[PDB]
Amino acid sequence: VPVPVPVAVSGATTAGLRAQAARLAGHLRERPALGPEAVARPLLLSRAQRERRAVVVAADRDSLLTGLDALAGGEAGPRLASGAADVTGRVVLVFPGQGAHWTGVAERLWREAPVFADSMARCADVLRDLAGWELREVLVDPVALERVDVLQPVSFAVVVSLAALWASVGVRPDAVVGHSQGEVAAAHVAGALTLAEAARIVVLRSALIARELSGRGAMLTVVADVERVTALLAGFEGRVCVAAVNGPASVTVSGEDGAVREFERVLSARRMLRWRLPGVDFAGHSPQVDALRAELLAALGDIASREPEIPLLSTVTGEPATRLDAEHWYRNLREPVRFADAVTALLDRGHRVFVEVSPHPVLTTSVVDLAAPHRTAVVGTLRRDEGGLDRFLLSAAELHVRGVPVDLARHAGAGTAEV
Structure with a gap:
């Protein structure tokens, strides 16, 4: 081949x-x-x-x-x-939260790209200890991936390993931002958490979500701004809440399935675009999470963390992260995701290159909307049903053609044929 x-x-x-x-x-x-x-x-x-x-x-x-x-x-x-x-400026790696993963992703890339294979195997070691199961086996299992306790750590492994693959072609972050569970990956890639400690957070938190919240909620992303969504949530107080503000045309809401279905009817009648988040069967960033405060703080205990070696813009606060203690990782799940705020803070500090480190691009159009009218390069990594080294290299090429430094030659082979 x-x-x-x-x-x-x-x-x-x-x-x-x-x-x-x-x-x-x-x-x-x-x-x-x-x-x-x-x-x-x-x-x-x-x-x-x-x-x-x-x-x-x-x-x-x-x-x-x-x-x-x-x-x-x-x-x-x-x-x-x-x-x-024509693009100059500093580089951000963006780590998605929910809704980007697709069943089968990472298996082909494990076969094709040794740096990605290595990182995935390192992830598998840590997850084997914590969760029991075998990362590579679960990648291709659509039944296992509908379980939140399997999907979240698998998703974490894949995005961390894609970041390693980007680094191997000389694309390294000057700053990172992680949406919802992506914040744990971002913290690790920024050097604030070891792989083991980050994996432990995702594994313990996702297992708790699965035990207590799964089957009791849903999440829905809407193509609208938060002002408009807030207006339409009149009469939904305490039933459907804003869970994320991603951009001027992407806001996510959360609540019990029936209540979210009622809100979808409100949207539908007004010809507004929206979709449930794949892989999500719980009401993230809602008052349902309050109950999962005591057991989470106990399970996590003291977090082993250190100062990030590059700026980590939290989507809890929309500002540079402070202490990454258990309470932070609780608020990462309870509090709305301030993704637009974090990205805007980076744009205002001279960041012009945004790499979504994901199986499929879910936040790129929001980054593009926020970045206007600056000259910026915004790329993802893989796409649905396109998990090969070829798709990775095309994403790296998308940076190259905008003048962003990337070591395409690492994968260009050993040819000497001229002109």
Whole structure:
């Protein structure tokens, strides 16, 4: 099975970029034995990376030529990234909470990417001790993944391991922000928690949620701002509450299933878009969590933590995190998620590159909405049903083509074929 490589071309203008794509395709068609793996390395390392950039992520000739023909003709393609190399500024890793995971994700990437494999195995060791079960076996089990005590730690392992894979291509955070359970991953990646201690938090908290809350609630994300959602929650006081404010067009609410169903009818009649969070059968960030305060504080006990080595913008407060003690991890579940606030605080401090470290992008459109009108690069990592190294490399390419430093050459192979 051939391995995908990023094949880079660039020009001073869009028309120059398209001409370079045509020229490379022509050169390849004259030389039938020449593969992407022969030319990728010198195209990154021996050529200037100019103002208008593209990458085709391809494992074979035919797929490279398909991409290059599309690029030459000004069309989009599924393994083609292109852009203006005009983004400067500091880098944020964004860690999702619920609703991004898809059954089967991480298995293919474990096979294809040794840095990701390693991190996943390290996660498996810690989770084996804590939870008993075997991480790699659960990845592909749709029944196990509908249990909150399995999904949350699996989700944590995958996002932590994707962050490690980003780091291996030189994409490291200047700051991190984690939405809901993502805050635990963010804290670990920032150096405030060991892998073991972060895993223990997620494992203990998710098991408690499953024992006490699962089956007693639901969560719903709505395409609207919090002012509008708050107006529509008139008459739902203490039945459906705001659980997250993600952006000007993304707000999540939480409550008992029936009550949330009643609110969906309110939305439906007004032609408003909304969806239940996949993997969530409980009312996060609601008064239902109050009961899970005493047992959580006891189970967690004293948290082993230290000062984060880079800024951690909490979605509990919307500000730089203070003490990450048991009470913080309680409030991480009880209090509404202040995601928009945290992202806005980073935008106001010169952050312009946002990498969602997720199986599928769930917060990128909110980051984009918040970032306007600044020049910013906003990317995810994987997508639903696209868990290969090829999808990872396309996300890395999406950064490259906006002028963000990333070591694509790490995965470009050992080719020496010129021009």
